[PDB]
Amino acid sequence: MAASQEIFLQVLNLADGDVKVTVLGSRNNSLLVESVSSFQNTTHYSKLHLEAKSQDLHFHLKYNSLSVHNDHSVEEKNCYQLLIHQDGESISSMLVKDTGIKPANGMAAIRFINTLHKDLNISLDTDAPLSVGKDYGVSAYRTVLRGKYPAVHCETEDKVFSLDLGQLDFGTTYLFVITNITSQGLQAWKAEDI
Numbered sequence: 151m152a153a154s155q156e157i158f159l160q161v162l163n164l165a166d167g168d169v170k171v172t173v174l175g176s177r178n179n180s181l182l183v184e185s186v187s188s189f190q191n192t193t194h195y196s197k198l199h200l201e202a203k204s205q206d207l208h209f210h211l212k213y214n215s216l217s218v219h220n221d222h223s224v225e226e227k228n229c230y231q232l233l234i235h236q237d238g239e240s241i242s243s244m245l246v247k248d249t250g251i252k253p254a255n256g257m258a259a260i261r262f263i264n265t266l267h268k269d270l271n272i273s274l275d276t277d278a279p280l281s282v283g284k285d286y287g288v289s290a291y292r293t294v295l296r297g298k299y300p301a302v303h304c305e306t307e308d309k310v311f312s313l314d315l316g317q318l319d320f321g322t323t324y325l326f327v328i329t330n331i332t333s334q335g336l337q338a339w340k341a342e343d344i
Contacts, residue, residue, distance in 0.1 A: 170212035258318035273303035
């Protein structure tokens with residue numbers, strides 16, 4: 151997907167307010183400047199130019215008055231998702247690498263990020279459950295039949311929930327961030343890999 155000394159970056163802002171993102175290179179060079187709204191539901195990707203085949207980029211995040219600096223290592227020819235999340239009264243970021251999954255006739259592919267304090271097991275299919283670890287753990291990708299997933303089984307050490315993953319389309323790789331437990335049950339934010 152991405153070329154030499156190049157990356158694609160998708161910013162997911164899971165904070166309660168807007169965040170201004172400033173990605174910097176090895177010499178105060180602004181590789182990306184973008185403000186993303188709280189749960190901005192966009193399938194938009196930014197191409198970033200690197201100085202080498204591998205680089206540590208500096209992510210400058212602005213949220214309310216607060217400023218947070220996070221470093222994240224990237225590599226050429228790759229696509230990433232920057233998950234900006236709440237860190238108390240402040241915010242923090244995580245960089246998730248995307249695997250390129252060639253479309254499989256009749257199939258979609260899925261992956262989860264667990265923001266809960268308890269580990270999770272998701273029943274997507276007739277095989278093994280999909281494990282997704284507590285405190286921003288990342289699940290494996292699972293190739294699933296295309297279709298509607300209105301009540302996917304989730305379970306912690308002590309409860310079992312339902313998630314509405316909605317329609318999962320062929321030729322699409324999804325990312326689901328398990329945000330909170332409301333009165334209505336478990337909540338999941340849907341995003342699409344590039």
